[PDB]
């Protein structure tokens, strides 16, 4: 998965 | 050097301290007592000079690490800086930490050989 932020 | 003249206006406050007895009598009497004994205060100057020179000769070459108590701010590498260190020790400000940082077994400064 793409490195989704918080 | 514009700020050297901005400190003049705040000095006008001493006029209010001048007015009124008590303050103006105690301060004057103690000032003229300090002026009447200029040689008792010269012993302290001589002590600071001698001890600063001795510390300069002995602990001069210790390397200045900022993680210790002999750093860029506190060192024996100049007479003004040694006098400042002695003033801090006389104030009693972690002087034992400086003593431990002057213990044998430290690294010498790169410039000193």
């Amino acid at each position: 998965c793409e490195p989704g932020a918080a | 050097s514009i700020t050297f003249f901005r400190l003049f206006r705040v000095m006008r406050l001493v006029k209010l301290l001048s007015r009124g007895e008590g303050i103006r009598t105690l301060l004057w009497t103690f000032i003229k007592s300090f002026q009447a004994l200029p040689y008792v205060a010269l012993l302290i100057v001589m002590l600071f000079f001698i001890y600063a020179v001795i510390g300069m000769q002995v602990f001069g070459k210790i390397a200045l690490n900022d993680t210790t108590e002999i750093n860029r701010n506190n060192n024996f590498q100049t007479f003004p800086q040694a006098v400042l260190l002695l003033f801090r020790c006389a104030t009693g400000e972690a002087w034992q930490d400086i003593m431990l940082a002057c213990m044998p077994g430290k690294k010498c400064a790169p410039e000193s050989e």
Binding site: - | T3, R6, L7, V10, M11, L13, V14, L16, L17, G22, I23, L26, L27, N73, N74, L84, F87, R88, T91, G92, E93
Partner: protein
């Protein structure tokens, strides 16, 4: 810490009721013998009244628990009781009036030096090394120290760091010269000869090393 308690505290909270009852009975009985101008009797009255206030407010709300700091004034009644301690207390606070021309000189010196350090060090200690990657943290080690941009004479950041603005302060923002509230406290703390070299070094790392010592040396020599 956080409203926790045990059995002993719950028992003391009920012994407090008996103590307040005794004090109120004393207050009422003493009130009907005289119809109170003494300072100690006034202290007793204002202790019992605030105790009643605290009890009533605690019952009503079931900060209220902050005005219970009037009970730490009850141990002062011991001085009232024994008269051999009132004499000593008067001997203590009677030679304090002479030390009032030295408490005003201290006030003047603190004000003067706080205004001088406010015309000299106002807002100059709000930048520190921050790394050149993902930052907002101060990679300036566990204890960050102020730096200066590569145009002044303050401390210069390390090889792999950059002096960037936007910093709280040397000690979470308490030790500063930002206004005549933060300077009046820094000057007092330096006068008490505790942590004055820390402030001197923080100024040394922010504005340079030539001039700042004249301030902090004369401040301790005079005050």
């Amino acid at each position: 810490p956080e409203d926790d308690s045990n059995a002993t505290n719950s028992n003391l909270e009920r012994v407090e009721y008996l103590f307040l009852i005794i004090f109120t009975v004393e207050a009422f009985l003493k009130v009907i013998a005289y119809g109170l101008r003494n300072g100690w009797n006034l202290l007793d009255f204002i202790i019992v009244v605030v105790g009643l206030f605290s009890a009533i407010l605690e019952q009503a709300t079931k900060d209220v628990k902050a005005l219970r700091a009037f009970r730490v004034l009850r141990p002062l009644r011991l001085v009232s009781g024994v008269p051999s301690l009132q004499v000593v207390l008067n001997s203590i606070i009677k030679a304090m009036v002479p030390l009032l021309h030295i408490a005003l000189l201290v006030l003047f010196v603190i004000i003067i030096y706080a205004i001088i350090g406010l015309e000299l060090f106002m807002g100059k200690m709000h930048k520190t090394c921050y790394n050149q990657e993902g930052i907002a943290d101060v990679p300036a080690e566990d204890d960050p120290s102020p730096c200066a941009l590569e145009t002044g004479h303050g401390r210069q950041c390390q090889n792999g760091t950059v002096c960037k603005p936007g910093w709280d302060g040397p000690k979470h923002g308490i030790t500063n010269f930002d206004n005549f509230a933060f300077a009046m406290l820094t000057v007092f703390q330096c006068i008490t000869m505790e942590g004055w070299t820390d402030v001197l070094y923080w100024v040394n790392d922010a504005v340079g090393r030539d001039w700042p010592w004249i301030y902090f040396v004369t401040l301790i020599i005079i005050g």
